[PDB]
Design a protein around this ligand. Structure first.
Ligand SMILES: Cc1sc(N)nc1-c1ccccc1
Ligand SMILES: Cc1sc(N)nc1-c1ccccc1
Lengths: 308, 297, 307
């Protein structure tokens, strides 16, 4: 079999993504019913930059599949410094059945996947956050049923990993995705083109706008994220002024559908991209969304392992 | 309805007796209780590393069938990247209990007010309640009933072990004496809570600078590292002091020991020392506490 | 009697063969042995981190049914805050074995003098005995019986791999040659221990600066990095002395036509070994890396049974 990897949301076809999301719902109901890693077999969970929350969901999820996660955090020498990335991948492939990697540039993930003989999963990268969006789609389906035809709007920095993955993963599910962002902070053109092509196959659409009011109107799902990642704190820009009109606050939420829900990948900077009232309010699904990282990532691993 | 264990008096006398009985049962049959089978997760978070505390909690959770997710001090501090309240809400979706080594008590209180799973103080600035459960297990297995015994702690009477031996000790019915120099005495709120609890159990609280009188007739003698050190040398737990205790007295020390400061080679390697059994019982007593908290939450 | 594994000759020739046979059995059936079911604990302690060593031990212990408790250098170094003997006595109450990566051999000896459970040297300044068990497992599966094979090691002849290939090699009956420049030769105590063990096994010890001669007719060619991190500030040019000992295609061509090449990794390609050799048909480095898992599990099973 071809080894399957999951480095970006569109690595799954629409039918494959539906299979993974249905498995996520099954695993939420019966969390120890799938044991492909019984043994235990190993899975590498490697952090070029620590993310303690990604650590909880993957370490526990792997264990609930019967496996043993070997967790490497940024205390270790960064992968590729002491030894070529290719050499490390060949050794890892002798010890583990899958490699979960949080890293920076997408080309590093691509390189690992080209040489490893086990599935490689992007746990979080500069360009994409596909496991978060699987958990988001699971959360939306829990609350609203069929995903096809829903309207989702994302607000804030339109070129970050969540904007890119909501575009790609959302249209793969048949969701009409809107990115509301200031000029200068718009989605990468190759990601946007990929999302537009995928939307053709599912009946979805891609919209990019600077009009936050228009993006909120009629939306079923509103999403935001922090405006600035750690790498961007020294980029020289004022990263508050451009985004203030895109804050997810009660006024924005009241423009959406009466049954709209609110998502946010965490961590949240309350008072910047989202207000306490919205985050702690009845439309917020952020805590269920965080829980579903555990279930959606287990489903993905089960699915990749059985295909590889 | 969620029970937490942040200080020794969080357990009533009757509840503490239940936990210590369970600790004895688990020492005999260490994999007979599997409330975390699955595995279910337990968070084990250190704001400052304590390797001894990691071993005992991590293995204990595994022997309950669970998986400990261990976060060492290297990682960004809990509460730096998001509110402790938001962290507690997310942790409560991934794990069945939160074991936390932090500094100030108000951080523990903040986590426990929000988390919907039990929170356990692994070790803090003000209290070390899990160590005192292990100490009480050790005393019981060597002397039987705890009620009425005399325990004396020597040295820094302001630290977490002095506070927890006062509260946990009087909760078990033990007459507790802290022997300490004048600048290093128990916190007055802790001392008062121990005096009140002592009225329920028949116990008592004494604080003195007279190490000789603290040692005379003691059944259990305890010390701890002293951290500038001249004030503690008269409270050194040495052979002279131990010679004053009741026959078959036992010496405890939470470790690590600095041999030649707070305790001598002769006392620590001698026949009264129960320091190695004490260390082993961190594993059993902490497992018992988790089983008990999980059942009531 | 508690059995420890601090240096390669801690096993007799017969005992080493038992461990290597077990390593082959565990490679075939990796979860058939569960001496640590429970789980029981095993301490895995790193005075200096080695992520690649952690993976093999942590997974191997789990596949024996146990739980590895890992301590790395972010914690207070063992010995600083209490005696090593006190720490050994407490660890012995929590775990069934102690795996330790540390520096001088006296530290390992101190731990093992008091521990009531097996102590295993995961990697130290003087020896790397678990790696050589994995090397011997690899040689055996590529060449068959070990007795009488000719193995040559190239590079820094005073490092942990040279010492362990000497001791573990002659324990298996292998004729071991160390090819190294003057000033970088095996420790005399280690060389003498290997010479004495070789008399029991029919093996031999050779130390030479003639890299050509060491490669000629060799069945196994081995190298390692020329510098450990603790040596970077030692004041020596640690490149020019070792260039003649590079494991390159010209050197490999001198060996037996069926020769294999070993390297404990990570490799610095272009220094001690070239891409052509690393990636060519004689290289066994990836199987070697895998066999760390199996050989270490076999060692643990064997020590636990005897302790
Ligand atoms: C994933 C990482 S990161 C590092 N310093 N080493 C490794 C590694 C792990 C297993 C095998 C080889 C290298
Ligand atoms: C292995 C290490 S490292 C450190 N600072 N303490 C310990 C330790 C662990 C368990 C018991 C006693 C000490």
């Amino acid at each position: 079999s071809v080894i399957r990897h999951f480095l970006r949301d569109d690595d799954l076809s629409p039918a494959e993504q539906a299979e993974v999301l249905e498995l996520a719902a099954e695993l939420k109901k019966d969390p120890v019913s799938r044991r492909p890693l019984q043994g235990p077999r190993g899975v590498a969970v490697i952090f070029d930059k620590n993310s303690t929350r990604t650590r909880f969901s993957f370490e526990l999820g792997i264990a609930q599949l019967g496996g043993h996660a070997v967790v490497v955090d940024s205390g270790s020498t960064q992968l590729g410094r002491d030894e070529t990335l290719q050499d490390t991948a060949k050794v890892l492939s002798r010890y583990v059945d899958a490699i979960v990697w949080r890293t920076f540039g997408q080309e590093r993930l691509d390189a690992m996947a080209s040489v490893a003989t086990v599935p490689v999963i992007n746990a979080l990268s500069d360009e994409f956050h596909p496991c978060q969006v699987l958990a988001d789609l699971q959360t939306i389906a829990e609350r609203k049923g069929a995903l096809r035809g829903l309207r989702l709007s994302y607000f804030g920095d339109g070129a970050n990993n969540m904007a890119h993955s909501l575009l790609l993963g959302g249209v793969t599910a048949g969701i009409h995705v809107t990115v509301a962002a200031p000029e200068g902070f718009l989605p990468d053109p190759s990601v946007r083109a990929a999302a537009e092509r995928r939307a053709q196959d599912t009946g979805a659409s891609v919209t990019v706008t600077a009009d936050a009011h228009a993006a909120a109107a009629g939306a079923d799902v509103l999403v935001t994220d922090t405006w600035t990642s750690m790498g961007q704190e020294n980029d020289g820009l004022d990263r508050v002024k451009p985004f203030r009109p895109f804050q997810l606050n009660s006024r924005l939420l009241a423009l959406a559908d009466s049954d709209a829900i609110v998502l946010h990948c965490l961590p949240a900077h309350r008072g910047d991209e989202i207000t306490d009232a919205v985050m702690d309010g009845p439309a917020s699904a952020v805590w269920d969304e965080a829980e579903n990282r555990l279930h959606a990532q287990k489903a993905l691993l089960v699915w990749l392992l059985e295909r590889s």
